[PDB]
């Protein structure tokens, strides 16, 4: 919805559709008829402590199928992607 491209270069540590972040790999973390639908953390292989409390975004797809109430009508992951996907495409998988 807005211009937020100046964070794809963030590697270490809101009404729009996608939260693009394909270059963030390590985290330590010490109406609503048109909302966010894609958590774009494609290259996320080390969450350290889980601490995952993201819930009830009402449209967030591909969060139940990611192995570490959000979206109940979602498209399937790529069958080559074997059901661990951050998105609908082959390059949107997970490794853990």
């Amino acid at each position: 919805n807005a211009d937020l491209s100046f964070l794809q270069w963030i590697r270490e540590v809101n009404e729009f559709s996608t939260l693009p972040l394909p270059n963030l790999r390590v985290v330590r973390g010490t109406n609503s008829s048109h909302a966010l639908r894609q958590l774009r953390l494609t290259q996320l292989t080390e969450i350290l402590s889980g601490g995952v409390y993201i819930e009830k975004n009402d449209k967030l797809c591909h969060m139940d199928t990611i192995d570490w109430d959000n979206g109940r009508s979602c498209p399937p992951c790529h069958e080559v992607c074997k059901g661990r996907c951050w998105g609908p495409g082959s390059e949107d998988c997970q490794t853990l």
Partner: antibody
Amino acid sequence: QVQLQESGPGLVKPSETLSLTCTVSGYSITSAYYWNWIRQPFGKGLEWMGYISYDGRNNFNPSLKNRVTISRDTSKNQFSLKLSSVTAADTAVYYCARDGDYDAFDYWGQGTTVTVSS
Amino acid sequence: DIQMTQSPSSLSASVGDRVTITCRASQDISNYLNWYQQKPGKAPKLLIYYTSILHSGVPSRFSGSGSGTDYTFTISSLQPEDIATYFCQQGDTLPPTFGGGTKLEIKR
């Protein structure tokens, strides 16, 4: 197996209210999905009235304000669309469709033809 | 407010030739763009959802491209089973508005 089908009267006077009912014969209605109404005037594009989620929400498409209403029954899988005070421009083919987040429409039902005149 | 254009509009093309139907959004954000194929007298059927990703059961012949606003429906080799009207879509707002409809006619 998901299938949608619509029923209702053919004509509607500009004084009465047109009522259409969409039923899902695939028994795929959960407290999950969005089911919406789409309009096609003859030789024109596709408009979109609005949807009803699992909870249910008010009218959409601000162009169709105070005219499009959607209801739910949960007994025999009925979603009733009412457009009140038709203004003779609603001579169109109507579709009831499913929804989601990425691929917006999946099955589309079949569509019924409605002509508005006296 | 909202607008949605499909460029080629009427489009002739022969059997077994690349076809590009260029869409547009007039919205800075339309990452989620779907391509439908509506046969004459039938309901629209889903071909592509979310730009590139093809929908289940759709032949891999159809493909999609484009990032910002300029989208592109490509057919690698047109066949006489493709003469339907090809529609666009967007999802970023309350109305999921479609395109004007690009009529594809095979030039036999």
